[PDB]
Design a protein around this nucleic acid. Structure first.
Ligand SMILES: O=P(O)(O)O[C@H]1[C@H](OP(=O)(O)O)[C@@H](OP(=O)(O)O)[C@H](OP(=O)(O)O)[C@@H](OP(=O)(O)O)[C@H]1OP(=O)(O)O
Ligand SMILES: [Zn+2]
Length: 385
RNA sequence: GCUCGCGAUGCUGAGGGCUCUG
RNA sequence: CAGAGCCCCCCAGCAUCGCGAGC
């Protein structure tokens, strides 16, 4: 019943692991098998009773080059924390839908009207990201073991490798830097046997710490949302994590209004999780609050065991978003969208968000940390049917 | 305090086998 | 079908140590 850093940390770890318990027949389910667990916990006050597990996810793999969807039906990245953020997106959509059904529901929604336009978060609402381990890339690649109590020092802080943007690589292990002669990925190229690169999770969370967690489409509706804390259940290295999360791009400049370099609370837990026994599960469990049960997606194909699209895929989210745009008057829009059709275009409508993202990419380039690796354009070139 | 090159030893997503278990 | 253990091999980075060169 407190709001100290460590008490908070242990609290959200406890809550997420517990909720995952409730969602998997108390860890008996075959879908309880996991290597990395992640989740998001909301707080609406300094008391732990005012804390609510929003989303829970597992997974350690990414889609194969073969199975990319030009329709956006696949999950490109099923590393636990990424999936957690996507589930959080679903929750946000649920809350916007809450605000827009009847005036009676508004008092129970986490959103309210914004004197700058569109919607914003009610005071004292905070989100907290939990990961059972350090996010792949800069935050963990150096020292993938627990820290030792005598020498927590990097011992080689000023190396070029430090802070560098790195990518998950298809069919290979370790998270590798970006190529100096990195011919940007092509759709037909990747489908023709080329190796798919995906930005590491450290890099992605830094990105979230600049452009927000809501992504481009929700910035049409809502003001930027940031994580107030990042809790690691194991492999917590303060200096490395702090570097990866924000510190390495302190040199960033000229951010659009309401956009800051978020520096969330970083904290491990008192009792670190031991490495989960057995093979690393082929799949990725997800769950958002207000759902009947978990959803199991095959991480290699980005779909479930029967080829059905996930509720977290680009398409589904776009459908939710479209259904929110229908119910929102143009004078409550932060950005002008008027008549939306294509995914990529609707993303580009969030001009401020896109400018912030540009500032991020430039921030990384100037520090000598590399150029961000985008999916081929064809990925976001689709509409609903 | 670094960078590059060459080695040595480890650490961290594929592919292919062997054995066992419900 | 599902799971476990072991083995072989690949992946391109990271760590440690040792040589050579340079800032
Ligand atoms: O949760 P993630 O797997 O990281 O998904 C993101 C997300 O794409 P969706 O929200 O459409 O799934 C980004 O979209 P934003 O909301 O940040 O705009 C997109 O960024 P772009 O807008 O630049 O496409 C990025 O893809 P990219 O690789 O192009 O950065 C992509 O990440 P993945 O491509 O790794 O799924
Ligand atoms: Zn990751």
């Amino acid at each position: 019943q407190l709001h100290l850093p460590q008490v908070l940390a242990d609290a959200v770890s406890r809550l997420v692991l517990g909720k995952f318990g409730d969602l998997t027949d108390n860890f008996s389910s075959p879908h309880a098998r996991r290597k990395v667990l992640a989740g998001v916990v909301m707080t609406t006050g300094t008391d732990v009773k005012d804390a609510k597990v929003i989303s829970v996810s597992t997974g350690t793999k990414c889609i194969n080059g073969e199975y990319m969807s030009d329709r956006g039906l696949a999950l490109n990245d099923c590393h636990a924390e990424i999936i957690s953020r996507r589930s959080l997106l679903r929750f946000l959509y649920t809350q916007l839908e809450l605000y827009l059904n009847n005036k009676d529901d508004q008092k129970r929604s986490i959103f309210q009207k914004s004197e700058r336009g569109g919607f914003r978060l009610k005071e004292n609402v905070q989100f907290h990201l939990y990961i059972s381990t350090s996010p792949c890339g800069d935050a963990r690649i150096f020292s993938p073991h627990e820290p030792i109590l005598e020498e927590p020092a990097d011992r080689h802080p000023n190396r070029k490798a430090r802070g560098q943007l790195r990518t998950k690589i298809e069919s290979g292990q370790g998270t590798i830097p970006v190529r100096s002669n990195a011919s940007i990925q092509t759709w037909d190229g990747v489908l023709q046997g080329e190796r798919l690169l995906t930005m590491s999770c450290s890099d992605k969370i830094a990105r979230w710490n600049v452009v927000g967690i809501q992504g481009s489409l929700l910035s049409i509706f809502v003001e930027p949302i940031y994580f107030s804390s990042i809790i690691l259940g194991s492999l917590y290295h303060g200096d490395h994590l702090s570097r990866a999360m924000y510190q390495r791009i302190s040199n960033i400049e000229d951010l659009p209004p309401l956009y800051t370099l978020n520096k969330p609370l970083l904290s491990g837990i008192s009792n670190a999780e031991a490495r989960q026994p057995g093979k690393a599960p082929n799949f990725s469990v997800n769950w958002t609050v207000g759902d009947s049960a978990i959803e199991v997606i095959n991480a290699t194909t980005g779909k479930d065991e029967l080829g059905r699209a996930s509720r977290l895929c680009k398409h589904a989210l776009y459908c939710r978003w479209m259904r929110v745009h229908g119910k929102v008057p143009s004078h409550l829009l932060r950005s002008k969208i008027t008549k939306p059709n294509v995914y990529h275009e609707s993303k580009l409508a969030a001009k401020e968000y896109q400018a912030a993202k540009a500032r991020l990419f430039t921030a990384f380039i100037k520090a000598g940390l590399g150029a961000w690796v985008e999916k081929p354009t064809e990925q976001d070139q689709f509409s609903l049917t």
